[PDB]
Amino acid sequence: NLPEHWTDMNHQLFCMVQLEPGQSEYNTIKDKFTRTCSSYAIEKIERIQNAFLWQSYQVKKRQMDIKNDHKNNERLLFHGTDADSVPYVNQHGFNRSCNAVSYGKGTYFAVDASYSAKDTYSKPDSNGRKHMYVVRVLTGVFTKGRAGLVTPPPKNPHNPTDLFDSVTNNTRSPKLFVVFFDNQAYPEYLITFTA
Amino acid sequence: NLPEHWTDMNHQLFCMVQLEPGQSEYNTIKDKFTRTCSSYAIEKIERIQNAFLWQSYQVKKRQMDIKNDHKNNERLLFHGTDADSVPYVNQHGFNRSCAGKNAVSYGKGTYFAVDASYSAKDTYSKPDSNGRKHMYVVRVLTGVFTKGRAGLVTPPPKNPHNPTDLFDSVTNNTRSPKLFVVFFDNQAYPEYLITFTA
């Protein structure tokens, strides 16, 4: 049950689709980036059409909507990666087992494109190209994280197995989210850009 | 997709169901266990009915069935754990970030044994304060596998020149597999808990 904005895949399950500059989809995603990254040059934006990653994400999304009994569990975040990790993330998504981990041993997602735009995350390749994903993240109900977490803390010490969905640096004004489970993040767009 | 032999859960998402000796379900697990663990005695066997884990598991199984060529992708395997781990596993399954380092390491992931005897070692199924040991019977998507290596944090590529086309799991020995390692969430469904004692 594959989204509208996706384009036909000739019965295949995976495709990177280069967006057309000037059209609505490219303009929406470019504007999310340029809010904090208007000094960088965008070379291209690719929609990630990964049927498997999508299915697994959508299943986790329906589970978290039931669990939390409301539907505001999704946020759009950024993730800066090096050139070598791009093929893996496109095909297999984010992997905590693969950078400071101050708020737990999960995958890190930035609210601001500027945070992910740092060279330590979006590592320039030899040609100077940087890579950042626009990611759908199931942040759900979150709390402050701390070093050493391997899962989010429980929502009550009385019930140790009922967990928060993610952790953040700051609950009132978050700038990053950590998630600790595969398939809590769908990599939706890859931005190729330069300094 | 909840299987029709599961007990009704009255719109609940999790339930442990104690099995009865003399039923085929209990007896087939007992026989699988006693095959290599005849010196131990089973206290009880519970069916694990976790709606969410089962759904995420079945999605990965259908994905691996499409990906691989008519492969038998799923094995029934054993997992020894400590009493402190049973509530997390029952509710959230098997988390590689919590895995113990195995005495013979074939990668940094969750280990599953062919033989109950392996899982029955006190190192895995640690005796609780009452002398009870705990072993899961687990549906595992082993898929297409190769000999593992201690450095692995994911299964290796089938081909070094295509680094993203991966083996599903690794084993200690591909001619005679005794353990499997899996590197991803929802690639194992904890189906039964065996409580046993000396």
Ligand SMILES: Oc1ccc2c(c1)sc1nncn12
């Ligand atoms: O401590 C970290 C580690 C990784 C990381 C961040 C903070 S923000 C970000 N965007 N992409 C990757 N990352």
